[PDB]
């Protein structure tokens, strides 16, 4: 169960090997801080 391979092919292969169509996080209603690491 190297279900971890499918993690890398989804982005790296990238849409030959089959995983579900996924919606990335910058596209959901999350607060703004969510992408602003602090310092």
């Amino acid at each position: 169960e190297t279900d971890l391979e499918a993690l890398f092919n989804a982005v790296m292969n990238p849409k030959t090997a089959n995983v579900p169509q996924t919606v990335p996080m910058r596209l959901r209603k999350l607060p703004d801080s969510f992408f602003k690491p602090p310092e």
Binding site: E1, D3, L4, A6, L7, F8, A10, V11, M12, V19, P20, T22, P24, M25, R28, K29, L30, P31, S33, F34, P37, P38, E39
Partner: protein, 204 residues
Amino acid sequence: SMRSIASSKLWMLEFSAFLERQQDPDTYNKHLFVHIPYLETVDIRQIYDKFPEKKGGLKELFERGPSNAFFLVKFWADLNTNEGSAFYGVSSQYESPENMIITCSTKVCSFGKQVVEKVETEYARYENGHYLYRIHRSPLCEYMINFIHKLKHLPEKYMMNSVLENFTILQVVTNRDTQETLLCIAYVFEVSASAQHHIYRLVK
């Protein structure tokens, strides 16, 4: 309180995952670290499909147990570190006013499907006015250890972030006797450019 990652019954004080190498003495890297203004709030419905669903699921858990025990953590993991005597551990520490036996379940899912679970029972120790629960230098599953290798071995960080898009970790801590849910922490990752985090109350 409303400022921290805590419920009426259970309070996370420490969390950290790490690699330490030996050699007469010892040296180690923090992949992550939290340590304990209101917390901001995330719409629980906005992450549901990044975690397992029908039946024994996040949606289910939330509706059920106290809605003050559900949090979302956003980590910026620090991957800049270097093979011989490498120990990959994770330690955490919780506080509670009351004396319990806690089951702590932690699920590594990818694409929302769980690929590995780890479960440990933890007992309390009386210190000052309350009780402490320490998970100590656990070890870290081979799965995760490999994940990190495959990650670090990528031309650019942003590709890493991109892969992380579908990697999450659900961590549920319940009371053994009363299956009451004490803490549920959702974890979603990015790689820092440099290690940091934002902690969110989950709401609906």
